[PDB]
Amino acid sequence: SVFDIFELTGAARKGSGRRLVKGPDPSSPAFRIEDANLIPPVPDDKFQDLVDAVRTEKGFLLLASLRQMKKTRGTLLALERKDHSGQVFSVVSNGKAGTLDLSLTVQGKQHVVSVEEALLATGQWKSITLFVQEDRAQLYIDCEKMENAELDVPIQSVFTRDLASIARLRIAKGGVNDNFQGVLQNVRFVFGTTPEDILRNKGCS
């Protein structure tokens, strides 16, 4: 039901691309990104569980706590092709535009949609709940107004059957200048749950 990416990448060893620090959740590890390129990709087999879950739910619920450097574009997660030709999907906290950008590449064509009024790039802690189902995206920042956006294709369109054999899930690393600058905590894919339930359990209402 829950997929904690940092947990899936393995142990945060010395020279692993990240440094253990403190986060809003005191009973869970936080990681300051030092060199995203060094953070290992999620293992193929574990990513396959994610793909299958996404295909079944026709989407997903993505949770993330982030402390991002102001006015920077930071990739939260990305699915990079193994052949190095590019990314098939990515979620970027765009601090320059004040948006959360969702990029999907299907059949060679890249579609990018921005979730407006979403500035998460403040030197302080923010929490997001991203609910994507079909071609619909809903973003909740902490306990604020829900932000919405429509994708050009359904999300399962990206999560093809043999996706884990041609792509790999990377955390904090995206485009050339888009590696996440700051701290991340509890970046997770949650299934069989709704954003409504997670918001209450978080203390909102």
Ligand SMILES: O=S(=O)(O)N[C@@H]1[C@@H](O)[C@H](O)[C@@H](COS(=O)(=O)O)O[C@@H]1O
């Ligand atoms: O410099 S001090 O403020 O004296 N030191 C404070 C402590 O007093 C405080 O309990 C914790 C946690 O604080 S919390 O607000 O995040 O719970 O953070 C710092 O260590």
